[PDB]
Write an enzyme that holds these catalytic residues in place. Structure first.
Site, PDB file in Angstrom:
ATOM      1  N   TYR B 122     -33.975 -16.485  -7.464  1.00  0.00           N
ATOM      2  CA  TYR B 122     -33.997 -17.277  -8.686  1.00  0.00           C
ATOM      3  C   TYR B 122     -34.109 -16.361  -9.874  1.00  0.00           C
ATOM      4  CZ  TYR B 122     -34.744 -21.089  -5.562  1.00  0.00           C
ATOM      5  OH  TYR B 122     -34.619 -21.959  -4.481  1.00  0.00           O
ATOM      6  N   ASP B 237     -31.985 -20.985   5.416  1.00  0.00           N
ATOM      7  CA  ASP B 237     -33.339 -20.573   5.806  1.00  0.00           C
ATOM      8  C   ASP B 237     -34.249 -21.779   5.910  1.00  0.00           C
ATOM      9  OD1 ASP B 237     -32.681 -17.733   5.492  1.00  0.00           O
ATOM     10  OD2 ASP B 237     -33.613 -17.712   3.558  1.00  0.00           O
TER      11      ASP B 237
END
Ligand SMILES: [Fe+3]
Ligand SMILES: [Fe+3]
Ligand SMILES: [Fe+3]
Ligand SMILES: [Fe+3]
Ligand SMILES: [Hg+2]
Ligand SMILES: [Hg+2]
Ligand SMILES: [Hg+2]
Ligand SMILES: [Hg+2]
Ligand SMILES: [Hg+2]
Ligand SMILES: [Hg+2]
Ligand SMILES: [Hg+2]
Ligand SMILES: [Hg+2]
Ligand SMILES: [Hg+2]
Ligand SMILES: [Hg+2]
Ligand SMILES: [Hg+2]
Ligand SMILES: [Hg+2]
Ligand SMILES: [Hg+2]
Ligand SMILES: [Hg+2]
EC number: 1.17.4.1
Lengths: 340, 340
Positions: B122, B237
């Site tokens: 991010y 994930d």
């Protein structure tokens, strides 16, 4: 006192490394100390999985080894498995509750994670060479000598975890807990952190380097190649782990981070010295266990306290302490072909 | 007493998942539950570095975006950064001191480490599209709508960590701590852990998937493709992270691990229903702030509300709870293509 997301907008560049407010947003775009972010990039660049290394021929080589040499090899492997079992969980349970800047928080998590890849490596080696793994894994816990060498490592961690718990629960002061007075003091908690951290530095800086020497001695004779490829990858990670602890301790010692931490470093100077000399001595005592039934080509107990003496002096002056041993060149220059 | 290396030779196959002896040896040759080993293996195979994804065109697309769409894009991203900031550290501080088998201990540390990679991706997306990242990062901590959508998470964890410290230090019983009565019971700490896990289950399985739908909506209009690459890797994930919490919760419920946890799951089944309803409601209330300046063509509050509704029912059934919302087909089937 501890929280997993403190609700205060705080300036993470102005926080101390430890005992400031808990990190809330994990940012990587800026940092008080660039070095921790660089160690995260570099450790991610070095990611490796043990299973890519073929250790099938090592089973044949270990079997052909002259018995006292099987002992030297497995005894050193058993101690390596113990250290990385402590280094997988402990950076995380012991240091994360005290970090106040995000880059050191994510470095302590990348470092503990690369430690569990090293523990995974050792299962991959053992299972491949010994046919009943349980015989070596169960001897780690009770073996007298592994506990004498590792003596003191769990203790530093456990006392810090316990003290941290009192601090966070009760805060500073003299308190009564069931009829007993318990004094919580942040200065004491900072000395405990400092000594803990100087002990982790002695663990990675010295305690692993003595076992790399035993693994690479076999590799020089073209034996246990495979195990050596893995120990090479581990040694490359530990160079970073050791960079990290040295930077943490020099920053605390320099007064650049928390003035009180530099005072504590200077007050604790003699105990650091004696503690490093005790770690070295435990490695020396270990060499007697290792070479009791005879030595091997390239390594014996004499060349080994020499090497431990050499490596302790390098690590100690790096973190600004005085050398205890008489200066030496490296007694085993062949090792630099496998390390740096 | 918490310890980093328990001195007892114990059969790690016979320990419970939680609240048994602290793990000493991290061995991976055998496991009580091989699903955690399979998940550590899978997660390590999926290793990815954010920095290798090219998000440069996302800067031009984000620049071209209308204001309300920049708002929908950045609000979503600010919340995702907040969640992985908490999920990078909290498993390790709250769960790790309570785990008693090695495979769960290393899965919880591999899982937490993959969350700090999501935090790092991010920062990579944000620093590439905005001219000064601090206006994003500094708003997260102080945004009240983010903190309203988040309320609950940091608190279950801090409560659990606090109760664990009183148990570690004081042990079970009724104690006098500074003139106050403090009762410590292991059954109450077990409930606390159990519902912490139900809550991690609900934040991963729901909150993330809502945020994924808002990210892939831009990708469906061929905007933000670099961000869509990272988010598709994160989603891969998260399928693993969610399998691990549903397996932990379902194994505890089956009564094959600790019998008392199977009782706790039955007794606490309505609190476990309620926190899923509360989480789903938090996600819907966000839509009001998310589309406050205007909506997008296939993405508005009614679409987000029925998607939350749809995915909450799928998640609750997978852990054997009763479904609160009307059953419906997937309101945005296009999300499948992006998810697998
Ligand atoms: Fe290691
Ligand atoms: Fe290390
Ligand atoms: Fe995540
Ligand atoms: Fe996750
Ligand atoms: Hg330490
Ligand atoms: Hg320590
Ligand atoms: Hg050695
Ligand atoms: Hg050695
Ligand atoms: Hg060795
Ligand atoms: Hg010291
Ligand atoms: Hg010192
Ligand atoms: Hg020391
Ligand atoms: Hg939890
Ligand atoms: Hg939780
Ligand atoms: Hg959405
Ligand atoms: Hg339940
Ligand atoms: Hg429940
Ligand atoms: Hg709805």
């Amino acid at each position: 006192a501890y929280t997993t997301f403190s609700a205060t907008k705080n300036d993470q560049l102005k926080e101390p490394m430890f005992f400031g407010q808990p990190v809330q947003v994990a940012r990587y775009d800026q940092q008080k100390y660039d070095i921790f972010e660089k160690l995260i990039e570099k450790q991610l660049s070095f990611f490796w999985r043990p299973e890519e290394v073929d250790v099938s021929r090592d089973r044949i080589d270990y079997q052909a080894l002259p018995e006292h040499e099987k002992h030297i090899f497995i005894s050193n492997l058993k101690y390596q498995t113990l250290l990385d079992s402590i280094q997988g969980r402990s950076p995380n349970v012991a240091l994360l509750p005290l970090i106040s800047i995000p880059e050191l928080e994510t470095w302590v998590e990348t470092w503990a994670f690369s430690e569990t890849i090293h523990s995974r490596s050792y299962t991959h080696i053992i299972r491949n060479i010994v046919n009943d793994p349980s015989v070596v894994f169960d001897d780690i816990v009770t073996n007298e000598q592994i506990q004498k060498r590792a003596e003191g490592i769990s203790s530093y961690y456990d006392e810090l975890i316990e003290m941290t718990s009192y601090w966070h629960l009760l805060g500073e002061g003299t308190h009564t807990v069931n009829g007993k007075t318990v004094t919580v003091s942040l200065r004491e908690l900072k000395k405990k952190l400092y000594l803990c951290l100087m002990s982790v530095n002695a663990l990675e800086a010295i305690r692993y380097y003595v076992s790399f020497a035993c693994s690479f001695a076999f590799a020089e004779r073209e034996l246990m190649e495979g195990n050596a490829k893995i120990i090479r990858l581990i040694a490359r990670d530990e160079a970073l782990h050791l960079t990290g602890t040295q930077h943490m301790l020099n920053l605390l010692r320099s007064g650049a981070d928390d003035p009180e931490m530099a005072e504590i470093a200077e007050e604790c100077k003699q105990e650091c010295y004696d503690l490093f000399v005790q770690a070295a001595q435990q490695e020396k005592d270990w060499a007697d266990y290792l070479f009791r039934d005879g030595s091997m080509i390239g390594l014996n107990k004499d060349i080994l306290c020499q090497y431990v003496e050499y490596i302790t002096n390098i690590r100690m002056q790096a973190v600004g302490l005085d050398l205890p041993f008489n200066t030496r060149s490296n007694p085993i220059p062949w090792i630099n072909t496998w390390l740096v």
